[PDB]
Design a protein around this ligand. Structure first.
Ligand code: NI
Lengths: 107, 107, 107
């Protein structure tokens, strides 16, 4: 989907993870976070629509999303092993990566 | 997945959106609608299994699904910005596209 | 995502299906099962990371996952038609395929 709809989805799902109780609520929201990244991995932010697809500034955005999909995958495995608290702790660091990525291309 | 299982998923998720209360319930169901389209974008309806992959009748089905995935993406962004009512209003028009697509290839 | 995080997701979602009440809870968990398979269809289990990508042992793992994604698709259509009980019955046989696949590459 659109880039900022996925980024707004990621931010809202982090608010569902922090207020979650069991590991099922955390695991499902983390998979919705993975879902939004897969639908928007092909997307392009609004301020980068007039940049070369091989431009390093656009190429910087591509690997930055790989890091985001990678960190989300890590938190899913922690939430899969039943570690509901340590996965929420991984969601704290995940929000740092999400917020830093969203601000760099929000415009 | 199978074409009509996704189309039945889309129809049921629309029934979850109309009876939803907050923006989280609408956003999650809209992502399930996006999920079903991604799993079945490669699929083929039963009545079109004996049509050429480059046939305009089959090619008409392909772009018709792009329109569906496009409208779903629009409603996700409206539900991402917090506009829970205007996104439900986008789900009303979404059901028109879903119903018209499903009837054309239901058989 | 990682192979065993998806396999742990599949196992937990089966526990959500057996204790589910309506067809919406079964259909959503079955789509999360389809979600985990799509994110990890490209993945590789830990004990098979040093095997040729064209090796029959690794190639056996690939088709084994196709069977899993195929059976999940079948149960989704049964849960899409409203058959909440017959889809739960398909989840019983689904757990057999999941457990047999996970044990063969758990290590
Ligand atoms: Ni995909």
């Amino acid at each position: 989907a659109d880039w900022e709809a996925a980024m707004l989805t990621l931010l809202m799902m982090l608010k569902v993870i922090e207020k979650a109780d069991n590991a099922a609520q955390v695991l499902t929201a983390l998979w919705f976070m993975a879902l939004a990244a897969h639908m928007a991995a092909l997307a392009t932010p609004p301020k980068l629509e007039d940049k070369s697809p091989a431009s390093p500034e656009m190429i910087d955005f591509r690997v930055g999303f790989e890091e985001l999909a990678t960190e989300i995958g890590k938190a899913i495995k922690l939430a899969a092993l039943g570690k509901v608290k340590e996965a929420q702790a991984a969601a704290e660091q995940l929000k740092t990566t999400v917020n830093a990525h969203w601000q760099k291309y929000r415009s």
